[PDB]
């Protein structure tokens, strides 16, 4: 299955030149799925559409009566349907049902199934189109299966592009290697998300009695982003083409912009070995954040005692706190708690206090009102999060704990954090607010009720914390993973933020106790202390070099040999050691019998 499926890439075309271009072409010598189809070996199976398809069928009478394309082709969303009426093509955008072998083949009155449109049965016909004789052009040629209908369907930028050609055939179930070019036919604007499709036989079993003929053959091959060189003639016709990916000779003659090459050595590309794995290494665990003070005091602060801090230069246990079964509730207003387990920040601000169970409703970042506004409410500008756990069992009392008082109203404290903490008769916006004289007032209820009170009363100790994001150094982080070490392979790696790609090796490179890594005379880095083992590793780059093709004249032979410059053949391909033949399409554009020289492999 090869040299089929080239199409004129667009409408701008021009005379007598070699044009090299990138598109979703069918790559040469890819394996096409031949649906050899015969009576009991029979059906119209749904097939994924991927990036687009080359499609072909052995034909004459339009036995492949059409196609359906879409996401589902049966339910909810719109679908494109394309049908050969006996004269012409029909196109619709409607959301057809198609539960079975597709036979909703009802049609308009003027030449039904023959001229005017078919499959009228659905509910969203935002586009409809009538062609002229585009089923008679198939029916023109002599006898069924003695011809190949040949198409490309590609979908991009909301357009379905349709290209076709039509050619003779000698074998009724084969796909011959003869080069031909498809002409454009449509650039349909329908905007449909196509991801699946099927061919339509519409319950047909042709009077072309080759087998009783519940039978045909049709062919599907997936398009791929590839570089083709296309050869135009003086009539603006594509006459030949080269898939530049196929083998080292195809790559050579694309690079040289020619169909013929003289005896010589030519430089074409760079070899560059890809990494096999990834190595991340970090020190012995240390510098744990001081959360035990804020979170794990035996008796928490009252609303007015409100213990508060900001913290830095430490590793956050927040993954454990998030994983903890304890807390009655916790919420993040900022980024998700699930990522605060491992994320990094410049610092945190953190504080803790208590509520009667009901008032936990008002305490959060993103939440404001006369409860929290007058004893603790933070600014909502940090990555703020809030947590609650049982005071009801611990620092409560059955009367309501009269030391754990209610919030202290002071309406005029509008500023965040300040949000009057204080134990004072101060409730108004601006009245004199001494101790208890008739000018001013204090709410002074008890918050800390014991666990036998109703589930509204049942009080919570509470923590708020607030992570700070800046371009400045992220002095707090969650804990970080260290991998196994991987000597003697090209890998990605990371020390303490010294990232690269290279081959890590054991080394004799003696250096002082205070030194972490060696530069070299170029001042690129070449050796590192492993932060966990204190191993002294040496780093070298993954192998790379020019690729050169050695050739006789293509006039004389299409055999080639390939030189990988400067590298050791040990690093070069998982090869198959035949002379002459490069298994190149799969294997490294190359792939065969090996010899070493000082110029390279």
């Amino acid at each position, epitope marked *: 299955s090869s040299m089929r499926g080239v199409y004129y890439p667009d409408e701008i075309f021009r005379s007598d030149t070699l044009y090299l271009t990138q598109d979703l072409f069918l790559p040469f010598y890819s394996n096409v799925t031949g649906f050899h189809t015969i009576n009991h070996t029979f059906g119209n199976p749904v097939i994924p559409f991927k990036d687009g398809i080359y499609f072909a069928a052995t034909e004459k009478s339009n036995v492949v009566r059409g196609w359906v394309f879409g996401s589902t082709m049966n339910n909810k969303s719109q679908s494109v349907i394309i049908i050969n009426n006996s004269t012409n093509v029909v196109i619709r955008a409607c959301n057809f049902e198609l539960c079975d072998n597709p036979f909703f083949a009802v049609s308009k009155p003027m030449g039904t199934q023959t001229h005017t449109m078919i499959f009228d049965n659905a509910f969203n016909c935002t586009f409809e189109y009538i062609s002229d004789a585009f089923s008679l052009d198939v029916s023109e040629k002599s006898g069924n299966f003695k011809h190949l209908r040949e198409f490309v369907f590609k979908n991009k930028d909301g357009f379905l592009y349709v290209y076709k050609g039509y050619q003779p055939i000698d074998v009724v179930r084969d796909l011959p290697s003869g080069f031909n070019t498809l002409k454009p036919i449509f650039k349909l604007p329908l905007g449909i998300n196509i991801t699946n499709f099927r061919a339509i036989l519409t319950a047909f079993s042709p009077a072309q009695d080759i087998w009783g003929t519940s039978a045909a053959a049709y062919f599907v091959g997936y398009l791929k982003p590839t570089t083709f060189m296309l050869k135009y003639d003086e009539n603006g016709t594509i006459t030949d083409a080269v898939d530049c990916s196929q083998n080292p000779l195809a790559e050579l003659k694309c690079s040289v912009k020619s169909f013929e090459i003289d005896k010589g050595i030519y430089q074409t590309s760079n070899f560059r070995v890809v990494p096999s794995g990834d190595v991340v290494r970090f020190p012995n665990i240390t510098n744990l954040c001081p959360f035990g003070e804020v979170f794990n005091a035996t008796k928490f602060p009252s609303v007015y005692a409100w213990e508060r801090k900001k913290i830095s230069n430490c590793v956050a246990d927040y993954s454990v706190l998030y994983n903890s079964t304890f807390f009655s509730t916790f919420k993040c207003y900022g980024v998700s708690a699930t990522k605060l387990n491992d994320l990094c920040f410049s610092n945190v601000y953190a504080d803790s206090f208590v509520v009667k169970g009901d008032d936990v409703r008002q305490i959060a970042p993103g939440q404001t009102g006369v409860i929290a506004d007058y004893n603790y409410k933070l600014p909502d500008d940090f990555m703020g999060c809030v947590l609650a756990w049982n005071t009801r069992n611990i620092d409560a009392t059955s009367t309501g704990n009269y030391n754990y008082k209610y919030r202290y109203l002071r309406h005029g404290k509008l500023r965040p954090f300040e949000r009057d903490i204080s134990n004072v008769p101060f409730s108004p916006d601006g009245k004199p607010c001494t101790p208890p004289a008739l000018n001013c007032y204090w709410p002074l209820n008890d918050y800390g009720f014991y666990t036998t009170t109703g589930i*509204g009363y049942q009080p919570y100790r509470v923590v708020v914390l607030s992570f700070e994001l800046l371009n400045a150094p992220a002095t707090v982080c969650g804990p970080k993973l260290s991998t196994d070490l991987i000597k003697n392979q090209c890998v990605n790696f990371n020390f303490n933020g010294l990232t690269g790609t290279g081959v890590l090796t054991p080394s004799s490179k003696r250096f002082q106790p205070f030194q972490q890594f060696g530069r070299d005379v170029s001042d690129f880095t070449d050796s590192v202390r492993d932060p966990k083992t204190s191993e002294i590793l040496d780093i070298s780059p993954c192998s790379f070099g020019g690729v050169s093709v050695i050739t006789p004249g293509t006039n004389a032979s299409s055999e080639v040999a390939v030189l990988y410059q400067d590298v050791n053949c040990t690093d070069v391909s998982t090869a198959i050691h035949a002379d002459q033949l490069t298994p190149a399409w799969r294997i490294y554009s190359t792939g065969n019998n090996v010899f070493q020289t000082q110029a390279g492999c």
Partner: antibody, heavy 131, light 114 residues
Framework: QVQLVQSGAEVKKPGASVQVSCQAS????????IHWVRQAPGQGLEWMGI????????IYAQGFQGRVTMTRDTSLNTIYLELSSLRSEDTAVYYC????????????????????????WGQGTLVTVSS | DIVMTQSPDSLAVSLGERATINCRSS????????????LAWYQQKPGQPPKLLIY???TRESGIPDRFSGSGSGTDFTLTISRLQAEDVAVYYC?????????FGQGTKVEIKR
């Protein structure tokens, strides 16, 4: 809201253990706290017990703290009963309330607002004192 | 408690008559940060977990009987309970959308003048 289902209607013998079964999903057992069905099936199954099946965090009235004690039946993402001191309180309807709709674009066990009264109801089940 | 409780335990309307679901709750239900008030009518059969079917207690929400919900009033409520041998007979009470402890109680059962 949740993948809501309830079952496991049983007679709870005076002073013995009590058990039940449910199914749940998403916000109703993880953002909002689910409710343990904790009133007799002659009425609505009032949320005298409060639970998070996706974390083991719980709150209760002090009869229901034992008589409708609950555990995470992880295969259903939902509560299964594991109660003690069975009686007329343990005779509550065999149900788990998929909690009220999420109060914010929150994260974690965030139900400092929004109720344990159901956004989704598992249809529940019977129960009684086994005397 | 904030498991909000019905007052009647069963309803008392005549055929098509406009009886009420009387109810009571905990404290600060019309809360200063949220303002829409947290009491909502439960409207569903006995043995179920109590499901919220009249958000903010002014009228029935989607899937409620419409004749079975109405005016909330902070610590107290009085929903419509029309023809409550049927329709509003789907067992009902005020219930909290309040926080962790929020619920409906036993709910008023179906009943009518006879």
């Amino acid at each position: 809201q949740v993948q809501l289902v309830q079952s496991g209607a049983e007679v709870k013998k005076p002073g013995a253990s009590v058990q039940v079964s449910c199914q749940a999903s998403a916000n109703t057992f993880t953002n909002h706290y689910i409710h343990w069905v904790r009133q007799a099936p002659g009425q609505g199954l009032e949320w005298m017990g409060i639970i998070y099946p996706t974390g083991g965090n719980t709150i209760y009235a002090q009869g229901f703290q034992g008589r409708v004690t609950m555990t995470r039946d992880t295969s259903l993402n939902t509560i299964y009963l594991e109660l003690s001191s069975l009686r007329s309180e343990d005779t509550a309807v065999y149900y788990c309330a998929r909690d009220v709709r999420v109060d914010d674009s929150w994260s974690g066990y965030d139900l400092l607002s929004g109720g344990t009264y159901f956004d989704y109801w598992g249809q529940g089940t019977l129960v009684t004192v086994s005397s | 408690d904030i498991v909000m409780t019905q007052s009647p335990d069963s309803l008392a309307v005549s055929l098509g008559e406009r009886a009420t679901i009387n109810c009571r709750s905990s404290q600060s239900v019309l809360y200063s940060s949220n303002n829409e008030n947290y009491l909502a009518w439960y409207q569903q059969k006995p043995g179920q977990p109590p499901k919220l079917l009249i958000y903010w207690a002014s009228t029935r929400e989607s899937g409620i009987p419409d004749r079975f919900s109405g005016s909330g009033s902070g610590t107290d409520f009085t929903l419509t309970i029309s023809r409550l041998q049927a329709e509003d007979v789907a067992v009902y009470y005020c219930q909290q959308y309040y926080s962790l402890p929020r619920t409906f109680g036993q709910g008023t059962k179906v009943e009518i003048k006879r």
